[PDB]
Amino acid sequence: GIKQNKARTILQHLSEAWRCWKANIPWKVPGLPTPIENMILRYVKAKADWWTNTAHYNRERIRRGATVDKTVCKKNLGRLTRLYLKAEQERQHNYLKDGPYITAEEAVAVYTTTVHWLESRRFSPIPFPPLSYKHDTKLLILALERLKEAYSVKSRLNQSQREELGLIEQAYDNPHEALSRIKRHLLTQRAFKEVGIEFMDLYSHLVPVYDVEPLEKITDAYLDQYLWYEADKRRLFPPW
Amino acid sequence: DETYGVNVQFESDEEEGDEDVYGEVREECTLSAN
Amino acid sequence: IFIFNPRTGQLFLKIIHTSVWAGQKRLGQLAKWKTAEEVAALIRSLPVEEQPKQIIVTRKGMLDPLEVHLLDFPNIVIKGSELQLPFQACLKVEKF
Amino acid sequence: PKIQQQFSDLKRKLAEVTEEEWLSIPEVGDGELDMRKIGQARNTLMDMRLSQVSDSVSGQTVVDPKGYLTDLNSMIPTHGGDINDIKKARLLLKSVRETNPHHPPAWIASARLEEVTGKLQVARNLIMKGTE
Amino acid sequence: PWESEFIDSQRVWAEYALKRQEAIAQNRRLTLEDLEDSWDRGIPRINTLFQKDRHTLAYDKGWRVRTDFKQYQVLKQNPFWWTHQRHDGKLWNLNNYRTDMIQALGGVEGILEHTLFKGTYFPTWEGLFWEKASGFEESMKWKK
Amino acid sequence: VNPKAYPLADAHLTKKLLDLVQQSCNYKQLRKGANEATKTLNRGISEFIVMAADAEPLEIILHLPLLCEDKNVPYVFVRSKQALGRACGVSRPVIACSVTIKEGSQLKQQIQSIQQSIERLLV
Amino acid sequence: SYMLPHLHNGWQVDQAILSEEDRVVVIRFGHDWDPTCMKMDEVLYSIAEKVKNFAVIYLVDITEVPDFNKMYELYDPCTVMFFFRNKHIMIDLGTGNNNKINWAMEDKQEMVDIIETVYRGARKGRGLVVSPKDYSTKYRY
Amino acid sequence: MFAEIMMKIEEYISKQEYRVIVDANNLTVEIENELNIIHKFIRDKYSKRFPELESLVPNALDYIRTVKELGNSLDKCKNNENLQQILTNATIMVVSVTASTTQGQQLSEEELERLEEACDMALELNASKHRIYEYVESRMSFIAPNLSIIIGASTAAKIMGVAGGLTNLSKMPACNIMLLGAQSVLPHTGYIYHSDIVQSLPPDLRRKAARLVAAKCTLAARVDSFHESTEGKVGYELKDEIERKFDKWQEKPLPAPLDGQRKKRGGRRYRKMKERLGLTEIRKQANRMSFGEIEEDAYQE
Amino acid sequence: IDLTLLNRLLRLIVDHNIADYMTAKNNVVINYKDMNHTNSYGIIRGLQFASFIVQYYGLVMDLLVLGLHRASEMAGPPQMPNDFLSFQDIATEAAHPIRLFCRYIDRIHIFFRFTADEARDLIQRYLTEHPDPNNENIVGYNNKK
Amino acid sequence: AVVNTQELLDLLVKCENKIQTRIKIGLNSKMPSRFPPVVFYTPKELGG
In chain G, where the domains are located: 2-136
Residue type, C91: L
Which residues of A are less than 8 Å from I103 in CB distance?
A: 240
Distance, in Å, from the CA atom of H119 to the CA atom of H111, rounded to the nearest integer, reads 12
Interface mutation target, options B8, B15, B31, chain D, most CBs of D under 10 Å = B8
Asked if D49 contacts H51 with a C-beta cutoff of 8 angstroms, the reply is no
Distance, in Å, from the CA atom of G52 to the CA atom of B30, rounded to the nearest integer, reads 71
**Strand residue runs (E) in chain C:** 2-4, 11-13, 54-57, 77-80
Closest residue by Cα to residue F32 from F50, F17, F20, F44 = F50
CA E97 to chain centre: 13
Distance, in Å, from the CA atom of H13 to the CA atom of H134, rounded to the nearest integer, reads 10
Interface mutation target, options A195, A206, A222, chain I, most CBs of I under 10 Å = A195
Residue G44, Cβ neighbours under 10 Å: how many? 25
Distance, in Å, from the CA atom of E107 to the CA atom of E102, rounded to the nearest integer, reads 5
Closest residue by Cα to residue A31 from D14, D28, H244 = D28
**Interface contact flag, C29 H280, Cβ < 8 Å:** yes
Distance, in Å, from the CA atom of G35 to the CA atom of G33, rounded to the nearest integer, reads 6
Give the one of C29, C33, C64 whose C-beta lies nearest to H284's C-beta: C64
**Interface contact flag, H297 E128, Cβ < 8 Å:** no
Give the one of A8, A11, A67 whose C-beta lies nearest to G140's C-beta: A67
Minimum distance, in Å, between the CA of residue D94 and any CA atom of chain C: 12
Distance, in Å, from the CA atom of A238 to the CA atom of A163, rounded to the nearest integer, reads 39
Asked if F35 contacts H173 with a C-beta cutoff of 8 angstroms, the reply is yes
Residue E43, CA atoms < 13 Å, CB-side half-sphere: 14
Which residues of J are less than 8 Å from E101 in CB distance?
A: 41-43
Asked if J10 contacts E70 with a C-beta cutoff of 8 angstroms, the reply is no
Q: Which residues does F54 contact at the CB level (< 8 Å), separation at least 6?
A: F1, F2, F79, F80, F81, F82
Question: Which residues does residue F50 pair with via DSSP β-bridges, in sequence order?
Answer: F76, F97
Which residues of C are less than 8 Å from B10 in CB distance?
A: 27-28, 31-32
Give the end-to-end CA distance of chain F in Å, rounded to a whole number: 18
Asked if G89 contacts G122 with a C-beta cutoff of 8 angstroms, the reply is yes
D47 sits in which H/E element: helix D35-54
Distance, in Å, from the CA atom of H94 to the CA atom of D44, rounded to the nearest integer, reads 9
Distance, in Å, from the CA atom of I12 to the CA atom of D56, rounded to the nearest integer, reads 12
Residue type, D8: S
Distance, in Å, from the CA atom of A84 to the CA atom of A197, rounded to the nearest integer, reads 11
Number of residues that this document lists for chain G: 141
Experimental method: cryo-EM
Residue H294, Cβ neighbours under 10 Å: how many? 16
Sign for the CA dihedral angle at A161, A166, A172, A176 comes to negative
Distance, in Å, from the CA atom of G98 to the CA atom of G110, rounded to the nearest integer, reads 16
Residue A33, Cβ neighbours under 10 Å: how many? 17
Closest residue by Cα to residue G124 from G69, G79, G84, G94 = G84
Interface contact A149, partner I, CB < 8 A: no
Interface contact H102, partner D, CB < 8 A: no
Distance, in Å, from the CA atom of E144 to the CA atom of A156, rounded to the nearest integer, reads 12
CATH number of F1-123: 3.30.1330.30
**Resolution to one decimal, Å:** 2.9
Asked if D59 contacts A120 with a C-beta cutoff of 8 angstroms, the reply is no
**Interface contact flag, D45 A104, Cβ < 8 Å:** yes
Residue type, I135: N
Interface mutation target, options E20, E39, E49, chain B, most CBs of B under 10 Å = E49
Vertex G134: Cα angle to G130 and G139 (nearest 5):
160
Distance, in Å, from the CA atom of F52 to the CA atom of C96, rounded to the nearest integer, reads 69
Pairing, β A195-201 against β A206-211: antiparallel
Q: State yes or no: cis peptide before F57, omega within 30 of 0.
A: yes
Q: After which residues is chain D broken (C to N over 2.5 A)?
A: 30
3-state SS string for chain I: CCHHHHHHHHHHHCCHHHHHHHHHCCCCEEECCCCEEECCCCCCCCCCCHHHHHHHHHHHHHHHHHHHHHHHHHHCCCCCCCCCCCCCCHHHHCCCCEEEEEECCCCEEEEECCCHHHHHHHHHHHHHHCCCCCCCCCCCCCCCC
Residue D73, Cβ neighbours under 10 Å: how many? 11
Asked if A233 contacts I61 with a C-beta cutoff of 8 angstroms, the reply is no
Interface contact J15, partner G, CB < 8 A: no
State the virtual CA torsion across I80, I85, I86, I91 in degrees, nearest 10: 130
Neighbours of chain F (3+ CB pairs under 8 A): H
Distance, in Å, from the CA atom of D17 to the CA atom of A32, rounded to the nearest integer, reads 11
Distance, in Å, from the CA atom of G29 to the CA atom of G6, rounded to the nearest integer, reads 10
Asked if H135 contacts H12 with a C-beta cutoff of 8 angstroms, the reply is yes
**Interface contact flag, I8 D51, Cβ < 8 Å:** yes
**CA nearest H237 in F: which residue?**
F57
Closest residue by Cα to residue G55 from G7, G123, G127 = G123
Give the one of C28, C59, C88 whose C-beta lies nearest to B12's C-beta: C28
Distance, in Å, from the CA atom of H92 to the CA atom of H94, rounded to the nearest integer, reads 5
Residue A119, CA atoms < 13 Å, CB-side half-sphere: 15
**H224-231: Cβ within 8 A, 24+ apart:** H224/H143, H224/H144, H224/H145, H224/H146, H224/H147, H224/H166, H225/F59, H225/F63, H225/H166, H225/H167, H225/H169, H225/H170, H226/F59, H226/F62, H228/F57, H228/F59, H229/F57, H229/H145, H229/H146, H230/H145, H231/H145
Closest residue by Cα to residue H97 from D45, A97, A112 = D45
Q: Which residues does H198 contact at the CB level (< 8 Å), separation at least 6?
A: H192, H206, H209, H210, H213
**Interface contact flag, F63 H229, Cβ < 8 Å:** no
Closest residue by Cα to residue F42 from F63, F5, F84, F71 = F71
Distance, in Å, from the CA atom of A73 to the CA atom of A53, rounded to the nearest integer, reads 15
Q: What does residue G100 show for φ and ψ, rounded to 5 degrees?
A: -120, 175
Closest residue by Cα to residue E78 from E92, E65, E93, E68 = E68
Closest residue by Cα to residue A235 from I20, D56, I76 = I76
Interface contact E105, partner J, CB < 8 A: yes
**Interface contact flag, H98 D48, Cβ < 8 Å:** yes
Closest residue by Cα to residue H128 from H32, H195, H42 = H32
Helices H, strands E: what count in chain C? 3, 4
**Interface contact flag, J42 E108, Cβ < 8 Å:** no
Distance, in Å, from the CA atom of A128 to the CA atom of A186, rounded to the nearest integer, reads 9
Q: What is the largest CA-CA distance in chain I?
A: 61
Interface contact E71, partner A, CB < 8 A: yes
Asked if D38 contacts A99 with a C-beta cutoff of 8 angstroms, the reply is yes
Closest residue by Cα to residue A67 from J21, D100, G101 = J21
Give the end-to-end CA distance of chain C in Å, rounded to a whole number: 12
Q: What does residue A163 show for φ and ψ, rounded to 5 degrees?
A: -70, -30
In chain F, where the domains are located: 1-123
Give the one of B3, B13, B30 whose C-beta lies nearest to D59's C-beta: B30
Interface contact C54, partner H, CB < 8 A: no
Q: Which residues does E34 contact at the CB level (< 8 Å), separation at least 6?
A: E19, E23
3-state secondary structure of C1: coil
**Interface contact flag, D84 C28, Cβ < 8 Å:** no
**Interface contact flag, B27 E29, Cβ < 8 Å:** yes
Which residues of D are less than 8 Å from B26 in CB distance?
A: none
Interface contact B23, partner E, CB < 8 A: yes
Integer angstrom CA distances of residue A204 from A74, A201, E69, G116: 15, 8, 18, 37
Q: After which residues is chain E broken (C to N over 2.5 A)?
A: none
Asked if A79 contacts A51 with a C-beta cutoff of 8 angstroms, the reply is yes
Question: Which residues does residue A200 pair with via DSSP β-bridges, in sequence order?
Answer: A207
Interface contact H8, partner F, CB < 8 A: no
F67 sits in which H/E element: helix F59-70
CATH number of G2-136: 3.40.30.10
Using left for φ > 0, alpha for ψ between -120 and 50, and beta otherwise, residue F10 falls in beta
Interface contact E6, partner I, CB < 8 A: no
Chains E and A touch (3+ CB pairs under 8 A): yes
Interface contact E51, partner B, CB < 8 A: yes
Asked if B29 contacts D59 with a C-beta cutoff of 8 angstroms, the reply is yes
Asked if E30 contacts B24 with a C-beta cutoff of 8 angstroms, the reply is yes
Residue type, H116: E
Alpha helix (H) ranges present in A150-213? 159-173, 175-188
Distance, in Å, from the CA atom of E140 to the CA atom of E134, rounded to the nearest integer, reads 8
Question: Which residues does residue A43 pair with via DSSP β-bridges, in sequence order?
Answer: none
Closest residue by Cα to residue I78 from A225, F58, B31 = B31
**Interface contact flag, F57 H173, Cβ < 8 Å:** no
**CA nearest B11 in D: which residue?**
D95
Sign for the CA dihedral angle at I41, I44, I48, I52 comes to positive
3-state secondary structure of G57: strand
Integer angstrom CA distances of residue A104 from A240, B1, H54: 29, 80, 17
DSSP state of F13: H
Rg (CA), chain H: 33
Distance, in Å, from the CA atom of D61 to the CA atom of I11, rounded to the nearest integer, reads 8
Residue A165, classified by CB atoms within 10 Å of its CB into exposed (0-12), middle (13-18) or buried (19+), is middle
Residue G41, classified by CB atoms within 10 Å of its CB into exposed (0-12), middle (13-18) or buried (19+), is buried
Residue A80, Cβ neighbours under 10 Å: how many? 20
Give the one of D41, D47, D51 whose C-beta lies nearest to H91's C-beta: D41
Distance, in Å, from the CA atom of A181 to the CA atom of A136, rounded to the nearest integer, reads 13
F31 sits in which H/E element: strand F30-32
Interface contact E32, partner B, CB < 8 A: yes
Pairing, β F96-100 against β G55-60: unpaired
Asked if A204 contacts E66 with a C-beta cutoff of 8 angstroms, the reply is no
Vertex H57: Cα angle to H54 and H58 (nearest 5):
65
